[PDB]
Amino acid sequence: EVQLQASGGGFVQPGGSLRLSCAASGATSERDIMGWFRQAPGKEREFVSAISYEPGGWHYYADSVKGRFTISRDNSKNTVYLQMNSLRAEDTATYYCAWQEIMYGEAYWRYWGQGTQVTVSSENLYFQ
């Protein structure tokens, strides 16, 4: 009943930065690991980054985005941020935020709502 909305996407050039965001909606002691996954059109889902939504929580990054991305949180605002730096053409996808939930004894990503589109490409190149 509670779904997470990713927001803050947009159009950027290679090497630019973007800070997506996602309100920790329905966060409890049971669901407190929000993962990020992106899906380029036509391609399969690709997990991106995760954070443990507890004090001292850890920060997981996939090898593709490691060193360039930086997950974080604001407890006062109850919001997780995904600070994207050194953006590349490969980061072009729709990004969602999801809560981890254990079903059938395995870790599942659940409760993702509206994604945020991100497009990374030059804008000052022309050819008829």
Task: CATH number of the domain at 12, please.
Answer: 2.60.40.10
Report the C-alpha gap between 73 and 46 in whole angstroms.
22
Sole residue written with tokens 């779904």 = 3
Give how many domains the chain has, as a whole number: 1
Sole residue written with tokens 């006062």 = 76
Asked whether residue 127 is domain-assigned, the answer is: no
Whether the CB-CB separation of 72 and 85 falls below 8 Å is answered with no
Report the C-alpha gap between 95 and 5 in whole angstroms.
10
Asked whether residue 124 is domain-assigned, the answer is: no
Asked whether residue 126 is domain-assigned, the answer is: no
Report the C-alpha gap between 103 and 101 in whole angstroms.
6
Report the C-alpha gap between 53 and 10 in whole angstroms.
26
Asked whether residue 101 is domain-assigned, the answer is: yes
Nearest Cα neighbor of 6 from 87, 119, 85, 117 is 117
Whether the CB-CB separation of 49 and 35 falls below 8 Å is answered with yes
Resolution attained, angstroms: 2.1
Asked whether residue 70 is domain-assigned, the answer is: yes
Whether the CB-CB separation of 52 and 73 falls below 8 Å is answered with no
Domain that holds residue 102: 6-119
Asked whether residue 91 is domain-assigned, the answer is: yes
CA distances from 125 to 79, 110, 118, 121 (A): 37, 40, 19, 10
Whether the CB-CB separation of 53 and 32 falls below 8 Å is answered with yes
Asked whether residue 16 is domain-assigned, the answer is: yes
Asked whether residue 1 is domain-assigned, the answer is: no
